[PDB]
């Protein structure tokens, strides 16, 4: 998906 | 583990209904109270011995620190699953051939564990008998069946218990008295059935049919149903108190009265209000100091009203009941009802007409004005 | 009304913070997502979670804690863990590069880029707070993050909030046990600050907890999951009077003024009882008179020290569960009749007692036996002066040949600052000597 | 094996009691403080008639 | 027309003070709801002393509840009988006192007492004929000893010609539930001896030994200790609201008892106490109560009466009994214990008899003693003070708020003045 | 009742208008077919303001969609709500303006206004009681600035006793998406100041900064920005369509915020904005709305309010709430920020209350603010206008269409008088 790697605002991408 | 109930209390000043959360801990028997409106604690965790787990069902009144709280709701899904899921409500009929042993039948039901919430001894007319036996309108034995159900008074009772329908039908057993005696003699029909036609009992089989029977007998609209068997002549009034009803000695009182020999003219169950109790005890105001104690004991729960006939088997009913204090009754007249079934002067489990003048007025207040 | 703010700094503070906050949810019946179960409902007047959790209008509970770490590899475990829906997504502050066991990176070079954001959160949590009572800072003496970043953070709080109590919880470097090699350095650089800014600083170490886990619990090979559960139960026993009702309750200020006699003697010890396994408690009965004697034995001390060398100065017994005050009163007078427990003559009364009503709760999957009563002992002793003695001896052999200094002076730290920090613990050593003498 | 070389984070279980079924970790350990008679019935008892 | 104002401060005084209200409402037949629910007319003839009739025939107490932390205020309001108080009588702060005497008297207590006596000024003005005050506190802390001492000096300036009476729990030698306890005890006796007309000392150790030997209780929790103190509170003032054979109110218990203005610390007691096992084996008559009255085990302070002398002893008997056997028998105590009572005062004994026994017990007799043996309870606090003061321990919390070191020297000097006078008359 | 005739010119106005008629279709529960699928009867009682009744229970917007180029008309009619606009309301020219003011105002925008004025006059007379006009365009384009401001002049001379509100897209320095637009920005504000009662300046750095720090979207396309513009456009007239405790129509906002006829340049904001992760954590409370309201980060123009001093501020609140916490909060912020309001007018804050918050939300509040820091917007365009006019850059596209060079001299002469009088009442 999106935001797999832990950099550059990954938490919001994992949320949405 | 705790059980939560929402309770109403009527404030004597503001004339306001107030909602509280009542939390009971059955592991240790302590209560706690919270306020819904103000979101603050009303009473901390306090060991209250008077409140018990058997007194917790919806619609009940419990006296918690001189406040009468009526439980109206279930607090949460946990207590709604643990208590209200199993409970079922059903109807019991005592036929005219079992009127003499109606006390023993009520005693058997009390040992079975049913809670009686409505009770009425009454006579059924022809149209009400037709509505009762509309399922048997194909007429296998309809003429003699209607004649048997109409020739004498019956007793209709509302009884609540877990698995109530199955337990009551298992208690009654087979319809034929000889078949019931052959199979299992411990059944009510087996013990007190002279024949299959005179089964001396009746029990509904399905939920919709049972609800139809309640709509016929005890009308939810509030209108008057079938008439009571009130004779209004040569009669006295006697009340089985709420503490005696909750303890379960009602069958013993009926058996003791029957063995004494006085005839029960009428019998019903009432849930009284404070003003009705005050106007029933209006003669006791200014005479005794514990008038409020007697009033509060009377409206603390439902009471069983009785009209008792002819009062002359051996002695009058007042001296059969005996002295007002149960300790005095036990010490002086050991055969009296207050000696047998009494605990406190306030809670002595029977009330009798002290004045011979006032008996007809009490019977008129209970069996005419109220119903 | 009663409130506390918890800040977890460094790897040691955050990892215990994972263990203390999982226990706090079980006490108040809060699921890991941050909501209460739908089967059971709470009463209207509940302030039990108001100490640690803040009510959101959507029926969600949010902890009152800040998790600051200069490296991301530990906070990202929390954000990707099973408690990802519990904490605030913005209270979890992270940096880019760690302190690398350097005090100069955590205080002078890298620690000055984030502290404007760190104090912004503490301002927000305190402004939403109605009545604030103290702080609970979790760190360790050894790390560059636990020593460097704690120093400039906590001095800014004393500037901002004047007379608010501040309670650390620090991992003491053990005598024979040490992981880093800059360990004698970073302890000296912390204690130059915590004397004039802290009111009660509690100490625990890894080595004494290892031997407690070896004998009592029969855990032959303890690990970090085992230690942080034991430390988390003491903090939940200290704060138990602000959350629940008790026979006689102790506020944060009440044991703050009863435990420190002098402004430079504010380093109490933590002791918990009974730490026992499941099988041993099945045979041995737990009385009130026995668990209170278990605290005063030297084998149950959670700091590797000998309490028999020094003398006791002030003690605080904090009970929980089904404890009546009559049994405690005869238990204390039993202890004062013993001659091996030596109290100072200038402090005739030294015990203060707090009794609560709720028993401890065991975390499932744990090791601790489920019991009824438990007691946490907070004692101020003079025996910890020997602990500071051997740490200064470790410092003096490093600085004799000027080893490991060129990493510190390369980031902005002066060479001379080691001299003022060393003479401070020279003064702290004889301050314990000056109060321990009799008349 | 578990008695001599146990895994990490697990208590050393004796081989004699290893196959013994366990009821100890479930129940409550310790002695219960006994309830006493209340001071109400000792100082201001229930009035007699 | 005889009015008593109650005030509750501290945690130890609030729990005993709350427990005082279940006892008298049981005697006067008041429900927890607030209605009169009893059996006798004779209860309602004097209800103006403690309660206030409100609209609708409900009774509210005349008491003011003050404490700096709202935890104990919520603990009393959420009690069994807690719903009858005035909701505007609950005066609480938002910061804990911290068991510091300078926090309850100088900074955090100085902003509250403007709103504290303002409620008291309302309840005092609406009375017809005020008689006195009753304040419950403890000497061993900073809350009860901080505002309790302060509320004594502020009220006594407004109302000088009254009798302001406090019931105070004193520090104990063996228990020691506070570390700075002799510091906070000495700072209050400096102003207790100056502006209080009657003080009753209650001990925590003596109430333990009564529960352990006389009552033979197994676990004497704090719900029982407050019920012993609550009996003596309702026994000393029973001649203001019940008809008796020989009546004696607090000012008559003022003139008889104190010869000199600085000796007014009394040792109380209750006397029909028995254990559960030996109820049937004890004879209940006036000569048996007298031995229990003068028993040293039945005293509520850790002072041995046999190691001192008695100035003045009073007894408030209760119930239907004779007067000759009351008077002849408690004179027999004076003749046999002749050396123990003083020689320069004849008739050390005052006897009072009321005709209403308490709930369920046919007789009662509360002991009140004014002896010289109370100097040893005051000596032990003075000696504990010296051992900490010579090292100046725990004194940056007091000096850091505005309290001076010269205040502490004056308090110990006045404490040593008080122990000197008891030995002087001995 | 009080019908709002929405105008929609240019390419920027069409994309704002396509997003504006999507939000209030969600508010009134209007499906893309045109019927009504709602639950509560509060939506249908006041629906004549924005929608017009037809046969079969079909509601159509009272919107006029105008552009000189048919390219964006195909994108409007092929959107999500493209089948709800009336086919007779698409007035389109054949040739584009080409980012020139004179082509859109004198030559190519002169024949199309005759067809538009037939449509507008037909719709205006169909209203029972007309309330005003509302227009959205762009100052940096050819059709929106050149020809949209021509319709403002022609409407104002036919219906004088009405109200005119514009949602104009002022240009930005770093979002310079046209090299000639200081010519079009200068000549547009010369027409705007005399024929407009309310002006809401909307910028793009203001919206692009918000989606990075507040909504933290990684790809903020124009559909994200047009929602924030359309959220303000529905929050300003929310008391005109819904009941409340204290209503305020469009004329009530113009009375309070306009003390002088040449001070009608507002600068807006919207109160409840938070990221996707912060939805479940933040508690929406009246101080939480007001704290975000007055901050310069959420404000929707490229001007810092701290470099100027406020004249008059209005706040339109929505949602069930309590008036004490409302009335206390904008009195309290007036007390600390006593230096940020001029002292010659007391009690500068207008309060408006509705009862119906938007869907999925419980409390909402729209910030409208008059400020003298909007002079910083007009000083940047004026210094750019003079820089080319010294060297006569790009002038032959203008003087070759009919306009003289003196029109450029009077456009800056009136615009320099505006920045002269904003500065005077600040001091
Ligand atoms: N009890 C306990 N001690 C820990 C834990 N984590 C680290 N420590 C102790 O911390 C010491 C090293 O300091 P750290 O806390 O790891 O370093 P730091 O504070 O994170 O500083 P940086 O690594 O530079 O970010 C070790 O000697 C450990 O004893 C833990 O989870 N539990
Ligand atoms: N009888 C009784 N004594 C108490 C209670 N709580 C505390 N105490 C006594 O009060 C002493 C401490 O005083 P404290 O309550 O801290 O004083 P405060 O801070 O002014 O309230 C202890 O030694 C206890 O013995 C109680 O509920 N009942
Ligand atoms: N915020 C926003 N700006 C837009 C949108 N569409 C166009 N613009 C702006 O409008 C400017 C171009 O306008 P233009 O199409 O030339 O206007 P026209 O020639 O009159 O049609 C560009 O600088 C864009 O930034 C939109 O949907 N949202
Ligand atoms: Mg680390």
Q: How far is CA D46 from CA B206, C331, D49, F54, in A?
A: 52, 36, 10, 85
* Chain D residue with Cα closest to B345: D49
DSSP run (H or E) holding E354:
strand E349-354
User: What is the Cα–Cα distance from D9 to B54, expressed in whole angstroms?
Assistant: 48
User: What is the Cα–Cα distance from E166 to E147, expressed in whole angstroms?
Assistant: 13
Task: Closest CB to E175: pick one of C1, C329, C348.
Answer: C329
Exposure b/e, C306-340, CB count within 10 A at least 16 = b: ebeebbbbbbbbbbbbbbbbbbbbebbeebeeeee
Do E131 and E32 share a structural domain? yes
- Among all chains, which residue has been given the structure tokens 């570390």? E179
Task: Closest CB to E361: pick one of D33, D34, D44.
Answer: D44
- Judged by DSSP in three states, B119 sits in strand
User: What is the Cα–Cα distance from C20 to C204, expressed in whole angstroms?
Assistant: 15
User: What is the Cα–Cα distance from E376 to E373, expressed in whole angstroms?
Assistant: 6
Question: Which value, to the nearest 10 degrees, does the dihedral of the CA atoms of residues E357, E359, E363, E365 take?
Answer: -80
CATH number of residue F383's parent domain:
1.10.287.600
**Do the beta carbons of residue E192 and residue E168 sit within 8 Å?**
yes
E56·B12 Cβ contact <8 A: yes
User: What is the Cα–Cα distance from E137 to E169, expressed in whole angstroms?
Assistant: 7
Beta bridge partners of C50: none
Q: For chain A, percent helix, then strand, then coil, each to nearest 5? A: 40, 0, 60
CATH number of residue C356's parent domain:
3.30.1330.20
Do C305 and C390 share a structural domain? no
E74·B41 Cβ contact <8 A: yes
Torsion angles phi and psi, residue E314, rounded to 5: -125, 155
User: What is the Cα–Cα distance from E244 to E241, expressed in whole angstroms?
Assistant: 9
Q: How far is CA F13 from CA B212, E187, F56, F262, F264, in A?
A: 69, 80, 30, 25, 21
**What is the DSSP code (8-state) at residue D41?**
H
Length of chain C: 439
User: What is the Cα–Cα distance from F196 to F261, expressed in whole angstroms?
Assistant: 9
C257·E397 Cβ contact <8 A: yes
> Which chain E residues are Cβ-neighbours of D49 within 8 angstroms?
none
User: What is the Cα–Cα distance from E76 to E85, expressed in whole angstroms?
Assistant: 10
User: What is the Cα–Cα distance from C338 to C340, expressed in whole angstroms?
Assistant: 6
User: What is the Cα–Cα distance from E308 to E103, expressed in whole angstroms?
Assistant: 37
Of the candidates F153, F151, F150, F145, the residue with the CA atom closest to the CA atom of residue F106: F150
DSSP run (H or E) holding B91:
strand B87-94
Q: Ligand 2 centroid vs E200 CA: distance in angstroms?
A: 16
Q: How many domains does chain C have?
A: 3
Pairing of strands B30-35, E3-8: unpaired
C44·B40 Cβ contact <8 A: yes
**Do the beta carbons of residue B229 and residue B283 sit within 8 Å?**
no
Do C378 and C407 share a structural domain? no
- Judged by DSSP in three states, C406 sits in coil
User: What is the Cα–Cα distance from E373 to E308, expressed in whole angstroms?
Assistant: 5
CA E9 to chain CA centroid, Å, is: 13
Task: Closest CB to E31: pick one of B41, B43, B66.
Answer: B66
> Which among F338, F357, F374 is the end of a domain?
F374
- Judged by DSSP in three states, C47 sits in coil
The residues, ordered by sequence, that sit 6+ positions from C97 with a Cβ below 8 Å of its Cβ are C70, C71, C110
D interface test, pick of E81, E215, E282 with most D CB neighbours within 10 Å: E215
CA distance C220 to chain A (A): 37
Angle at E404 between CA E402 and CA E405, to 5 degrees: 150
Pairing of strands C374-381, C312-320: antiparallel
CA distance A1 to chain C (A): 16
Q: Ligand 1 centroid vs C11 CA: distance in angstroms?
A: 5
Q: Ligand 4 centroid vs C12 CA: distance in angstroms?
A: 7
Q: How many CA atoms lie within 13 A of C362 on its CB side?
A: 21
- Among all chains, which residue has been given the structure tokens 């530990």? C74
User: What is the Cα–Cα distance from C126 to C286, expressed in whole angstroms?
Assistant: 42
Ligand 1 surroundings by CB, under 6 angstroms: C 10-12, 15-16, 71, 98-101, 140, 142-146, 171, 179-180, 206, 224, 227-228
DSSP per residue, C249-284: ---TTTTTTTT-SBTTB---EEEEE----HHHHTTS
Of the candidates F410, F421, F424, the residue with the CA atom closest to the CA atom of residue F189: F410
- Judged by DSSP in three states, F369 sits in strand
Do E238 and E311 share a structural domain? no
CA F46 to chain CA centroid, Å, is: 22
CA C161 to chain CA centroid, Å, is: 21
C44·B38 Cβ contact <8 A: yes
Do F385 and F364 share a structural domain? no
Extended beta strands in F179-323, E state: 198-202, 265-266, 269-270, 310-318
Name the token pair of C241. 């009077």
Name the token pair of E260. 């000199």
Do F269 and F168 share a structural domain? no
Torsion angles phi and psi, residue F137, rounded to 5: -155, -170
Pairing of strands F164-169, F198-202: parallel
Do C262 and C122 share a structural domain? yes
Longest dimension (CA), chain D: 75
* Chain C residue with Cα closest to D25: C278
User: What is the Cα–Cα distance from B236 to B36, expressed in whole angstroms?
Assistant: 47
Task: Closest CB to E276: pick one of D37, D44, D47.
Answer: D37
Do F274 and F175 share a structural domain? no
Do F313 and F245 share a structural domain? no
Do C282 and C189 share a structural domain? no
**What is the DSSP code (8-state) at residue F253?**
H
Do E315 and E206 share a structural domain? no
User: What is the Cα–Cα distance from C416 to C198, expressed in whole angstroms?
Assistant: 24
Do C350 and C285 share a structural domain? yes
Q: Which of C7, C8, C12 to mutate to test the pocket of ligand 1 (most atoms within 8 A of CB)?
A: C12
Of the candidates C332, C325, C318, the residue with the CA atom closest to the CA atom of residue C374: C318
Do C292 and C241 share a structural domain? no
Do F338 and F278 share a structural domain? yes
Q: Long-range contacts: B203-209, Cβ < 8 Å, 24+? A: B203/B90, B203/B91, B203/B92, B203/B93, B203/B165, B203/B168, B203/B169, B203/B172, B204/B90, B204/B91, B204/B165, B205/B165, B205/B169, B207/B165, B209/B135
The closest-lying atom of ligand 2 relative to the alpha carbon of residue C325 is: 25
Residue nearest ligand 3's atom 6 by CA? F12
D9·C220 Cβ contact <8 A: no
Sign of CA dihedral B179, B184, B187, B190: positive
User: What is the Cα–Cα distance from E365 to E355, expressed in whole angstroms?
Assistant: 12
Do C191 and C128 share a structural domain? yes
The reply to whether C145 sits in an annotated binding site is yes
CATH number of residue E152's parent domain:
3.40.50.1440
The reply to whether C193 sits in an annotated binding site is no
Q: Is C332 on the interface with E (CB under 8 A)?
A: yes
Pairing of strands F63-67, F90-92: parallel
Do C321 and C206 share a structural domain? no
Peptide bond into C274 cis (omega under 30): yes
Beta bridge partners of B61: B70
CATH number of residue C214's parent domain:
3.40.50.1440
Sign of CA dihedral B42, B48, B53, B56: negative
User: What is the Cα–Cα distance from B241 to B337, expressed in whole angstroms?
Assistant: 13
D9·C286 Cβ contact <8 A: no
Q: Is F283 on the interface with C (CB under 8 A)?
A: yes
Beta bridge partners of E64: E7
Of the candidates F279, F343, F272, F271, the residue with the CA atom closest to the CA atom of residue F314: F271
Do E380 and E367 share a structural domain? no
> Which chain A residues are Cβ-neighbours of F275 within 8 angstroms?
12
The closest-lying atom of ligand 1 relative to the alpha carbon of residue C102 is: 24
Task: Just list the catalytic residues of C.
Answer: 254
User: What is the Cα–Cα distance from F275 to C373, expressed in whole angstroms?
Assistant: 47
F177 lines ligand 3 (CB under 6 A): yes
Beta bridge partners of F315: F351, F367
- Judged by DSSP in three states, E351 sits in strand
**Do the beta carbons of residue C322 and residue C373 sit within 8 Å?**
yes
**Do the beta carbons of residue E143 and residue E188 sit within 8 Å?**
no
Q: In what order do the strands lie in the sheet with B68-74?
A: B41-47, B30-35, B17-25, B3-10, B68-74, B61-63
The reply to whether F204 sits in an annotated binding site is yes
F225 lines ligand 3 (CB under 6 A): yes
User: What is the Cα–Cα distance from F43 to F47, expressed in whole angstroms?
Assistant: 7
**What is the DSSP code (8-state) at residue C225?**
H
User: What is the Cα–Cα distance from F259 to E50, expressed in whole angstroms?
Assistant: 67
**Do the beta carbons of residue F282 and residue F215 sit within 8 Å?**
no
The closest-lying atom of ligand 1 relative to the alpha carbon of residue C141 is: 13
CA F136 to chain CA centroid, Å, is: 6
The closest-lying atom of ligand 2 relative to the alpha carbon of residue E97 is: 19
Do E67 and E144 share a structural domain? yes
Exposure b/e, B275-289, CB count within 10 A at least 16 = b: ebbbebbeeeeeeee
The reply to whether F83 sits in an annotated binding site is no
CB neighbourhood size of F406 (10 A): 9
Name the token pair of F400. 């070759």
Q: How far is CA F237 from CA F197, F227, F247, in A?
A: 15, 16, 10
Q: How far is CA E176 from CA C317, C333, E173, E204, E228, in A?
A: 12, 10, 7, 10, 21
Resolution in A: 3.6
CA distance B327 to chain D (A): 10
Of the candidates C266, C243, C264, the residue with the CA atom closest to the CA atom of residue C256: C266
Q: How far is CA B357 from CA B235, B237, B283, in A?
A: 11, 12, 12
> Which chain C residues are Cβ-neighbours of F282 within 8 angstroms?
56
> Which among E257, E290, E317 is the end of a domain?
E257
User: What is the Cα–Cα distance from E88 to E118, expressed in whole angstroms?
Assistant: 11
Residue nearest ligand 2's atom 16 by CA? E141
User: What is the Cα–Cα distance from C433 to F387, expressed in whole angstroms?
Assistant: 81
| Exposed/middle/buried for residue B316 (C-beta within 10 Å: 0-12, 13-18, 19+) | middle
CATH number of residue F331's parent domain:
3.30.1330.20
Do C240 and C128 share a structural domain? yes
Q: Ligand 3 centroid vs F201 CA: distance in angstroms?
A: 14
Residue B261, by phi and psi: left (phi above 0), alpha (psi -120 to 50) or beta?
A: left
Name the token pair of E8. 């509750």
DSSP per residue, E319-342: SS--SHHHHHHHHHHHHHTTTTB-
The residues, ordered by sequence, that sit 6+ positions from E1 with a Cβ below 8 Å of its Cβ are E48, E128, E129
Do C368 and C277 share a structural domain? yes
Extended beta strands in C301-406, E state: 312-320, 351-356, 374-381
- Among all chains, which residue has been given the structure tokens 């078949």? B179
Which residue range forms the structural domain that includes residue F107?
3-257
Do E318 and E170 share a structural domain? no
Which residue range forms the structural domain that includes residue C361?
269-383
Cα Rg for chain E, rounded, in angstroms?
Answer: 21
DSSP per residue, C108-171: IISTTTTHHHHHHHHHHHHHH-SS--EEEEEEESSSHIIIIIHHHHHHHHHHHSSS-EEEEEEE
User: What is the Cα–Cα distance from F318 to F427, expressed in whole angstroms?
Assistant: 35
Do E168 and E292 share a structural domain? no
Residue E170, by phi and psi: left (phi above 0), alpha (psi -120 to 50) or beta?
A: beta
Of the candidates E240, E77, E225, E91, the residue with the CA atom closest to the CA atom of residue E151: E91
Name the token pair of E388. 């900490």
**Do the beta carbons of residue C125 and residue C66 sit within 8 Å?**
yes
Q: Do chains A and D touch (3 or more CB pairs under 8 A)?
A: no
Task: Closest CB to B66: pick one of E33, E40, E78.
Answer: E33
**Do the beta carbons of residue F287 and residue F169 sit within 8 Å?**
no
* Nearest bound ligand to the CA of residue C302: 1
Q: Which of F70, F140, F397 to mutate to test the pocket of ligand 3 (most atoms within 8 A of CB)?
A: F140
User: What is the Cα–Cα distance from E27 to E47, expressed in whole angstroms?
Assistant: 11
Do C343 and C243 share a structural domain? no
Of the candidates B329, B367, B39, B26, the residue with the CA atom closest to the CA atom of residue B229: B367
Q: How many domains does chain E have?
A: 3
The reply to whether F375 sits in an annotated binding site is no
DSSP run (H or E) holding E137:
strand E130-138
- Among all chains, which residue has been given the structure tokens 């005709």? E355
**Do the beta carbons of residue F100 and residue F398 sit within 8 Å?**
yes
User: What is the Cα–Cα distance from C79 to A9, expressed in whole angstroms?
Assistant: 12
User: What is the Cα–Cα distance from C105 to C86, expressed in whole angstroms?
Assistant: 31
Task: Closest CB to B44: pick one of E55, E58, E78.
Answer: E78
- Judged by DSSP in three states, C303 sits in coil
The closest-lying atom of ligand 2 relative to the alpha carbon of residue E225 is: 1
Torsion angles phi and psi, residue F370, rounded to 5: -80, 135
User: What is the Cα–Cα distance from F250 to F252, expressed in whole angstroms?
Assistant: 5
**Do the beta carbons of residue C342 and residue C211 sit within 8 Å?**
no
This structure was determined by cryo-EM
F171 lines ligand 3 (CB under 6 A): no
Q: Ligand 3 centroid vs B23 CA: distance in angstroms?
A: 65
CA distance F86 to chain A (A): 37
Do C89 and C213 share a structural domain? yes
Residue nearest ligand 2's atom 25 by CA? E204
User: What is the Cα–Cα distance from C292 to C377, expressed in whole angstroms?
Assistant: 9
């Amino acid at each position: 998906p999106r935001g797999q790697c832990l950099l550059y605002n990954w938490e919001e991408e994992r949320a949405t | 583990e705790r059980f939560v109930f929402i309770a109403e209390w009527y404030d004597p000043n503001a004339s306001l209904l107030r909602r509280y959360e009542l939390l009971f801990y059955p592991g240790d028997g302590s209560v706690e109270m919270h306020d819904v409106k103000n979101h603050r604690t009303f009473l901390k965790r306090t060991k209250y011995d008077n409140l018990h787990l058997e007194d917790l069902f919806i619609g009940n009144k419990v006296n918690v620190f001189s406040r009468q709280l009526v439980l109206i709701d279930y607090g949460d899904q946990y207590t709604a699953r643990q208590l209200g899921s199993r409970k079922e409500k059903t109807l019991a009929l005592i036929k005219p051939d079992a009127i003499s042993k109606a006390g023993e039948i009520i005693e058997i039901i009390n040992k079975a564990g049913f809670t009686i919430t409505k009770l009425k001894m009454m006579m059924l007319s022809r149209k009400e008998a037709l509505d009762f036996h509309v399922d048997h309108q194909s007429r296998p034995f309809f003429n003699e069946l209607i004649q048997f159900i109409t020739t004498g008074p019956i007793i209709a009772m509302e009884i609540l218990r877990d698995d109530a329908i199955c337990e009551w039908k298992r208690l009654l057993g087979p319809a034929n008295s000889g078949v019931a005696r052959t199979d299992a003699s411990e059944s009510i029909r087996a013990l007190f059935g002279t024949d299959g036609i005179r089964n001396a009992a009746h029990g509904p089989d399905s939920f919709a049919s049972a609800a139809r029977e309640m709509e016929l007998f005890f009308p939810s609209s509030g209108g008057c149903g079938p008439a009571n068997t009130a004779k209004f002549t040569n009669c006295t009034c006697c009340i089985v108190k709420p503490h005696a009803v909750s303890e379960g000695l009602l069958g013993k009182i009926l058996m003791a009265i029957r063995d004494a020999g006085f005839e029960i003219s009428a019998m019903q169950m009432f849930n009284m209000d404070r003003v009705n109790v005050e106007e029933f005890y209006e003669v006791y105001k200014g005479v005794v100091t514990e008038y409020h104690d007697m009033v509060t004991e009377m409206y603390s729960g439902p009471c069983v009203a009785m009209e008792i006939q002819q009062n002359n088997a051996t002695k009058t009913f007042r001296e059969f009941c005996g002295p007002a204090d149960p300790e005095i009754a036990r010490h002086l007249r050991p055969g009296t009802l207050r000696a047998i079934f009494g605990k406190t002067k306030i809670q002595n489990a029977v009330h009798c007409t002290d004045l011979p003048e006032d008996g007809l007025l009490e019977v008129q207040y209970f069996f005419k004005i109220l119903d | 009304m009663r409130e506390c703010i918890s800040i977890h700094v460094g790897q040691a503070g955050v990892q215990i913070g994972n263990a203390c906050w999982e226990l706090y949810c079980l006490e108040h019946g809060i699921q890991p997502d941050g909501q209460m179960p739908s089967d059971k409902t709470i009463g209207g007047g509940d302030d039990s979670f108001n100490t640690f959790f803040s009510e959101t209008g959507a029926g969600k509970h949010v902890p009152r804690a800040v998790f600051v770490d200069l490296e991301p590899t530990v906070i990202d475990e929390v954000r990707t863990g099973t408690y990802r829906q519990l904490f605030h997504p913005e209270q979890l502050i992270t940096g880019k590069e760690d302190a690398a066991n350097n005090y100069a990176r955590g205080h002078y070079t890298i620690g000055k880029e984030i502290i404007d954001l760190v104090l912004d959160r503490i301002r927000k949590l305190a402004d939403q707070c109605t009545g604030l009572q103290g702080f609970l800072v979790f760190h360790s003496f050894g790390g560059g993050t636990g020593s460097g970043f704690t120093s400039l953070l906590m001095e800014r709080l004393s500037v901002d909030y004047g007379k608010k109590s501040k309670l650390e919880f620090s991992i003491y470097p053990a005598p024979q046990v040490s992981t880093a090699v800059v360990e004698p350095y970073n302890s000296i650089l912390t204690t130059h600050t915590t004397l004039e800014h802290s009111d009660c600083a509690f100490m625990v170490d890894n080595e004494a907890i290892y031997d407690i886990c070896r004998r009592n619990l029969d855990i032959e090979r303890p690990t970090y999951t085992n230690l942080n559960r034991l430390i988390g139960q003491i903090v939940s026993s200290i704060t138990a009077s602000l959350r629940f009702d008790g026979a006689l309750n102790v506020d944060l200020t009440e044991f703050q003024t009863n435990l420190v006699p002098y402004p430079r003697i504010h380093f109490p010890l933590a002791t918990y009882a009974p730490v026992i396994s499941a099988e041993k408690a099945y045979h041995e009965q737990l009385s009130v008179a026995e668990i209170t004697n278990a605290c005063f034995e030297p084998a149950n001390q959670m700091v590797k020290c000998d309490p028999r060398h020094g003398k006791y100065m002030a003690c605080c017994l904090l009970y929980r569960g089904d404890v009546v005050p009559k049994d405690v009163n005869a238990a204390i007078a039993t202890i004062k009749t013993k001659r091996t427990i030596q109290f100072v003559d200038w402090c005739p009364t030294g015990f203060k007692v707090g009794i609560n009503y709720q028993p401890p709760t065991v975390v499932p999957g744990g090791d601790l036996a489920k019991v009824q009563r438990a007691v946490c002992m907070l004692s101020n002793t003079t025996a910890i002066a020997e602990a500071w003695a051997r740490l200064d001896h470790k410092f003096d052999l490093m600085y004799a040949k000027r080893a490991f200094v060129h990493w510190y002076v390369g980031e902005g730290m002066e060479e001379g600052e080691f001299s003022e920090a060393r003479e401070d613990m020279a003064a702290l050593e004889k301050d314990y000597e000056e109060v321990g003498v009799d008349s | 094996f578990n008695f001599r070389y146990p895994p990490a984070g697990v208590e050393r279980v004796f081989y004699g009691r290893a196959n013994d079924p366990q009821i100890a970790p479930y129940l409550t350990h310790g002695i219960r403080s006994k309830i006493s008679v209340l001071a109400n019935t000792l100082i201001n008892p229930q009035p007699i008639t | 027309m005889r009015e008593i104002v109650h005030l509750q401060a501290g945690q130890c005084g609030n729990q005993i003070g709350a427990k005082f209200w279940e006892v008298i409402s049981d005697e006067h037949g008041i429900d927890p709801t607030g209605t009169y629910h009893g059996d006798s007319d004779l209860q309602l003839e004097r209800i103006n002393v403690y309660y206030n009739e409100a609209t609708g025939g409900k009774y509210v107490p005349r008491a003011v509840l003050v404490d700096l932390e709202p935890g104990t205020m919520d603990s009393v309001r959420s009690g069994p009988f807690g719903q009858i108080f005035r909701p505007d009588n609950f005066v609480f702060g938002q910061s804990g006192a911290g068991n510091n005497w300078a926090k309850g008297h100088y900074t955090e207590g100085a902003e509250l007492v403007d709103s504290v006596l303002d409620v008291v000024r309302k309840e005092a003005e609406s009375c017809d004929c005020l008689q006195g005050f009753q304040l419950t506190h403890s000497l061993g802390g900073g809350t009860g000893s901080g505002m309790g001492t302060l509320l004594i000096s502020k009220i006594r300036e407004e109302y000088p010609d009254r009798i302001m009476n406090t019931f105070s729990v004193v520090p104990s030698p063996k228990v020691s539930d506070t570390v700075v306890e002799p510091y906070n005890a000495t700072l209050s006796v400096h102003q207790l001896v100056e502006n209080t007309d009657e003080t009753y000392c209650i001990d925590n150790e003596a109430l333990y030994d009564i529960c352990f030997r006389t009552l033979k209780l197994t676990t004497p929790t704090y719900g029982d200790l407050n019920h012993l103190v609550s009996a003596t509170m309702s026994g000393v003032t029973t001649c203001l609201r019940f008809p008796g054979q020989l009546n004696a109110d607090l000012r008559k218990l003022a003139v008889n008892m104190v010869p000199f203005p600085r000796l007014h610390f009394f040792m109380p007691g209750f006397a029909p106490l028995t254990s559960r096992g030996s109820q049937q084996y004890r004879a209940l008559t006036v000569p048996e109560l007298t031995q229990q009255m003068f028993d040293a085990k039945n005293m509520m302070a850790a002072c041995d009466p046999r190691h001192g002398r008695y100035l003045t002893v009073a007894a408030v008997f209760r119930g239907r009994m004779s007067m000759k056997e009351v008077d002849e028998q408690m004179l027999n105590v004076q003749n046999k214990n002749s050396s123990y009572f003083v020689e320069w005062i004849p008739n050390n004994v005052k006897t009072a008899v009321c005709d209403i026994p308490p709930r369920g017990l046919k007789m009662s007799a509360t002991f009140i003693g004014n002896s010289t043996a109370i100097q040893e309870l005051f000596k032990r606090i003075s000696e504990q003070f010296t051992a900490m003061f010579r090292r100046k321990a725990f004194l940056h919390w007091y000096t850091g708020e505005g309290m001076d070191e010269m205040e502490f020297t004056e308090a110990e000097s006045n404490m040593n003045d008080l122990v000197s006078e008891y030995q002087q008359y001995q």
